[PDB]
């Protein structure tokens, strides 16, 4: 294959140029349609704080209010996706993997009308859910509407588009354009062989939906840490000793989100109605501990700043964390849509932290901050769940531009990704697109 | 398939314990090596010049020692590279390319000395040449020789460790860790199919060797810019013109490396003698305007700095790109061991600031500095040329420590491989190993 | 985040004078400055801009040293030094923060105001 | 240099009216913005690029225009509303102020 090769390496990037502008009106598109779904939610849980004030006298219609305004916008979530399009359940990264492998199908007439406005009651409503799941799927199928819309033929074609989406999808989530490249390069493509995605094509649909945020989102950033202390070489030991407690928590809590799929299954067996009516528990849980306790519920991205400057005692962070480790379980194993990545950052910032007021403490000579165990905690669960630990890192690093710890955050995610191999647990997304091929099979 | 798929996922990410903990000593070797390596360009450099400040005195007596210094050294490279291992000559990534197609051997007995040797004489002469071209291969060789010492067996373990060697010979170069990492994945893995290189084993290689550059080098930076201004969303039109440019000089400069191999091929006809002699004049040629003229030599490190601050003059600037696009091809289009990488970013930022002062007197509405376009042009020579945009980006990220200008940094490289692409060119790494493969059956 | 400026008051004409804006609250550094002035009564008038390594100094369609525009960025102070002012000159100089939206730039925050008054 | 010419010099209103202030260039210019001034005070920047609201202003203002002209609208006007507007563009170096607009309230 010597005379194969010199073909192949003096061809080498000459992505066809009708991929290229399609991958450009992908990222249009999917900017448009994330912010539009930010926008939403938000819109959403202002009103939903907004009419506690009209109850504020009487405490106990307060506390109603809350569980209602929220199960209401639960259940209506979960209806529409039992009843229109089941597999834009829960984060949906898992079956735009699948359709990478070309073992799902992008049923997206169904699936971004049904995604969208049932990410909007969950996400909405206060649940413990990020919005990379929805956008995610959402810019997945979007880029098989324009294959399907345009006609486009070839694996390339349908392989690109399909991942440009994802990554532009990813991107407009977090205002992370290189961590979404990464997403598709190390988790998302086929892992056991050769893909025709081109990655020129998906940098131009990542630009435009880039650019699609900043025109609506400037001037406010999404997570501000300020500037830390740097790491100093002596200290780098205990970063690799908080990726080694990653590494045994990540299977385990792998084990819990897929075993409490199974045990919420057990209490309405399938039937759309029990289902839905299970969701409005959920919900309104959310809803209520929303007001009553803010850090234990939504997505987490306010406490984030709040943990990483100490601003937590310690007795609260092992309730938070307690607390939102069963408020997230409860929330994406029940099958709601919205993803179980941005709630899996918050646990990582609360423990990296909770860890860093122990250090603190005992290394006196070190002249620690607990701030730069909670950034190197903040990807560790990523790393330890998910598996994809370069992803993490960059996308960290993007949120919190904090370059100088890397080595740091660098040395917790392999620790972490490391010991969670040596534990025998399993990629958290594989794991799931795994079960759902399996029982896709298991019916005949 | 769907029954094969199932299993695969479920026994995702086990990269054998053997394999982990050989990247970890692979890595561990190749910062030792490559940090050295850096230690004795600079110890090199030293002597040069003491030597002028003892003969400060007889300037030409001086421009002299300047030369004759610079020469010996490059002879000396030169030499060693001929005489004992020929694949050993310029960048070295090629030959690591083809290593991991499993078509070129790894000869490590014969590299690790020339390169390591070879690489002190060109680089501490003051030669246009990068120290990743050596760390890369002198990288990947090292990881070729646990795998042998050791005799671990496996397509896996020949194409990890020497993958994982390569990467953590780029980080060394630049301290650069996610570059190091993403090289391996976007440019130097078999582009054309799937293959086992394990890229947790690549991670715990790229660690040790960063923590082994960190020892001997902390508290400093290659390059030191400071914080640059923000990049508001009506100027990137200016960032993505600016790709334009660099997406059709791109290919103009890759013909240009590639056809003065050639012609300097024709001056020596491949004999050890002439052409010694020859990279004794490029090398002695170095040595003087690296004295006379120091921006349009050596590696290029020292003037990025400068130039990004706008402290040099639009007729500098311009001077500087001509004379220093020469010297860059005269001195890797030579042969002589080391890599073309790095010039090339000095290249970028010397073109972005002059793009960039032009910018400033046509649109002063904008209230622009020059240095955001240096920092966008720094890596989009390497988007154009080597067609790595994702690495050139996270690398020039990685040594600037300027986040706010991603986006703008993301445009210029997108226009730069774009217009690369549209003009009719090629990854120079995958047409030098295009060529050399070429030889290979004739 | 305030702006308070100073050293305005009485000059004999043709003389000149220099007023200062001593920032606080906020990152003094890594943002531009301006000086805009209103005439007693009248309208509003940029003068000048600066931006922070002081490399670029942009004027309105002056003279020379008409307008000399300065900066101390260990201080937090920004100056502005008139000359051979005149009666046109006798008015309310505003200090005032530059920043930017999409791209097309305003005058983000500005200060109490500092009086000259040209006169014998 | 752009001469930005605001149209009523004075203008009175009653709270609850709907008014409404142009600014009009000579040439060509895109995203502008507006500046408060209220008697005795620095002037507060208002709306920016064009439509955009400063953190704080009340709702009942807006902005919009394209090319030529631009306007400033207050639907349903209120008392604490009585101050001078100036719009200012920046698309065109150097920039420029507008004549100003000064809002009076009947009562």
């Known amino acids: 294959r010597r005379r194969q090769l010199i073909r192949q390496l003096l061809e080498r990037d000459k992505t066809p140029l009708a991929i290229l502008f399609m991958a450009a009106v992908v990222g249009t598109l999917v900017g448009l349609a994330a912010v539009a779904f930010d926008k939403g939610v938000a819109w959403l849980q202002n009103q939903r704080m907004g009419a506690l004030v009209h109850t504020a006298d009487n405490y106990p219609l307060l506390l109603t209010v809350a569980f209602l305004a929220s199960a209401v916008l639960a259940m209506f979530g979960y209806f529409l996706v039992r009843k229109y399009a089941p597999e834009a359940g829960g984060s949906g990264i898992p079956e735009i993997e699948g359709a990478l492998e070309d073992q799902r199908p992008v049923r997206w007439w169904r699936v971004l009308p049904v995604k969208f406005f049932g990410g909007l009651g969950t996400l909405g409503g206060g649940m413990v859910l990020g919005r990379e799941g929805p956008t995610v799927q959402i810019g997945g199928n979007i880029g098989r509407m324009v294959l399907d819309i345009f006609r486009l033929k070839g694996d390339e074609a349908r392989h690109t588009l399909l991942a440009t989406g994802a990554a532009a999808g990813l991107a407009a989530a977090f205002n992370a354009p290189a961590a979404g490249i990464l997403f598709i390069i190390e988790e998302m493509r086929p892992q056991f062989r050769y893909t025709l995605i081109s990655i020129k094509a998906v940098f131009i649909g990542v630009i435009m939906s880039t650019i699609m945020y900043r025109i609506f989102n400037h001037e406010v950033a999404l997570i501000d840490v300020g500037k830390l202390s740097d790491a100093p070489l002596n200290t780098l030991w205990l970063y690799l000793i908080l990726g080694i407690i990653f590494g045994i928590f990540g299977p385990i809590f792998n084990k819990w989100v897929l075993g409490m799929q199974d045990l919420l299954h057990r209490v309405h067996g399938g039937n759309i109605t029990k289902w839905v009516l299970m969701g409005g528990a959920i919900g309104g849980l959310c809803g209520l501990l929303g007001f009553v306790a803010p850090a234990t519920s939504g997505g987490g991205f306010n406490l984030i700043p709040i943990a990483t400057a100490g601003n937590f005692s310690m007795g609260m962070l092992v309730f938070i964390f307690v607390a939102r480790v069963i408020t997230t379980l409860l929330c994406f194993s029940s099958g709601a849509p919205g993803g179980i990545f941005a709630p899996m950052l918050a646990l990582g910032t609360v423990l990296g932290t909770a860890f860093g007021m122990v250090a603190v403490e005992l290394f006196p000579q070190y002249h620690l901050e607990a701030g730069t165990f909670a950034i190197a905690g903040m990807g560790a669960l990523l790393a330890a769940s998910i598996r994809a630990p370069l992803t993490g890192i960059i996308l960290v690093l993007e949120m919190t531009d904090n370059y100088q710890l890397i080595l740091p955050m660098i040395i917790t995610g392999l620790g972490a990704t490391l010991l969670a191999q040596f534990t025998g647990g399993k990629p958290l997304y594989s794991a799931i697109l795994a079960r759902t091929l399996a029982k896709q099979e298991a019916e005949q | 398939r769907r029954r094969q798929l199932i299993r695969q996922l479920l026994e995702r990410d086990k990269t054998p314990l053997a394999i982990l903990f050989m990247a970890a000593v692979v890595g561990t070797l190749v910062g030792l090596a490559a940090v050295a390596f850096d230690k004795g360009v600079a110890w090199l450099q030293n002597q040069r010049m003491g030597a002028l400040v003892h003969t400060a005195d007889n300037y030409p007596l001086l421009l002299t020692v300047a030369f004759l210094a610079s020469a010996v050294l490059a002879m000396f490279g030169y030499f060693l590279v001929r005489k004992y291992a020929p694949e050993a000559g310029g960048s070295g990534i090629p030959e690591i390319e083809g290593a991991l197609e499993d078509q070129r051997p790894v000869r490590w007995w014969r590299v690790l000395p020339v390169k390591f040797f070879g690489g002190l004489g060109t680089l501490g002469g003051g030669m246009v040449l990068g120290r990743e071209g050596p760390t890369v291969q002198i990288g990947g060789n090292i990881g070729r020789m646990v795998l042998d010492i050791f005799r671990l067996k496996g397509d896996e373990a020949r194409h990890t460790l020497l993958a994982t060697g390569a990467a953590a010979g780029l980080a060394a170069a630049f301290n650069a860790p996610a570059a190091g990492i993403l090289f391996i994945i976007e440019e130097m893995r078999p582009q054309f199919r799937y293959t086992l290189i394990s890229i947790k084993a690549v991670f715990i290689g790229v660690i040790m060797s960063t923590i082994m550059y960190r020892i001997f080098n902390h508290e400093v930076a290659l390059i030191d810019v400071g914080k640059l201004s923000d990049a508001p969303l009506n100027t990137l039109w200016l960032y993505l013109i600016l790709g334009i440019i660099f997406g059709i000089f791109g290919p103009i400069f890759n013909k240009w490396v590639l056809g003065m191999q050639d012609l300097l091929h024709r001056v020596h006809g491949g004999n050890i003698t002439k052409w010694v002699l020859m990279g004794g004049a490029i090398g002695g040629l170095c040595g003087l305007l690296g004295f006379v003229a120091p921006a349009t030599s050596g590696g290029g490190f020292n003037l990025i700095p400068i130039a990004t601050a706008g402290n040099f003059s639009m007729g500098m600037l311009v001077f500087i790109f001509v004379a220093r696009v020469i010297t860059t091809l005269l001195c890797f289009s030579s042969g002589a061991p080391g890599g073309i990488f790095a010039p090339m970013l000095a290249l970028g930022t010397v073109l972005g600031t002059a793009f960039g002062m032009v910018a400033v007197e046509l649109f002063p509405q904008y209230h622009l500095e020059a240095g955001t376009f240096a920092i966008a042009g720094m890596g989009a020579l390497l988007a154009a040329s080597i067609r790595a945009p994702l690495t050139g980006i996270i690398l020039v990220l990685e040594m600037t420590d300027n986040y706010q200008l991603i986006l703008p940094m993301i445009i210029t490289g997108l226009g730069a491989t774009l217009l690369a692409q549209f003009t009719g060119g090629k990854p120079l790494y995958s047409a030098i190993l295009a060529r050399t493969l070429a030889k290979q059956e004739a | 985040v305030r702006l308070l400026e100073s050293g305005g008051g009485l000059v004999q004409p043709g003389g000149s004078l220099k007023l200062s804006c001593a920032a606080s609250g906020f990152d003094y550094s890594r943002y531009w400055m301006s000086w805009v002035r209103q005439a007693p009564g009248k309208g509003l008038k940029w003068i000048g801009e600066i931006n922070p390594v002081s490399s670029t100094i942009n004027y309105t369609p002056s003279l020379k040293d008409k307008f000399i525009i300065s900066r101390d960025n260990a201080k937090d102070t920004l100056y502005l030094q008139i000359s051979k002012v005149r009666s046109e000159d006798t008015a309310l100089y505003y200090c005032?923060?530059?920043?930017?939206?999409?791209?097309?730039?305003?005058?983000?925050?500005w200060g109490a105001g500092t009086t000259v008054t040209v006169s014998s | 240099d752009i001469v930005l010419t605001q149209s009523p010099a004075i203008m009175s209103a009653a709270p609850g009216d709907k008014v409404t202030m142009t600014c009009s260039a000579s040439s060509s210019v895109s995203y502008i913005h507006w500046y408060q001034q209220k008697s005795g005070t620095s002037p507060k920047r208002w709306i920016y690029?064009?439509?955009k609201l400063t953190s704080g202003v009340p709702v009942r203002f807006s902005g919009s225009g394209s090319g030529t002209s631009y306007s400033l609208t207050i639907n349903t006007m209120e008392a604490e509303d009585a101050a001078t507007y100036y719009c200012?563009?920046?698309?065109?170096?150097?920039?420029?102020f507008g004549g100003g607009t000064k809002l009076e309230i009947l009562r």
């Open positions: 005032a923060r530059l920043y930017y939206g999409y791209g097309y730039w305003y005058f983000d925050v």
């Open positions: 200012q563009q920046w698309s065109s170096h150097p920039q420029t």
């Open positions: 690029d064009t439509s």
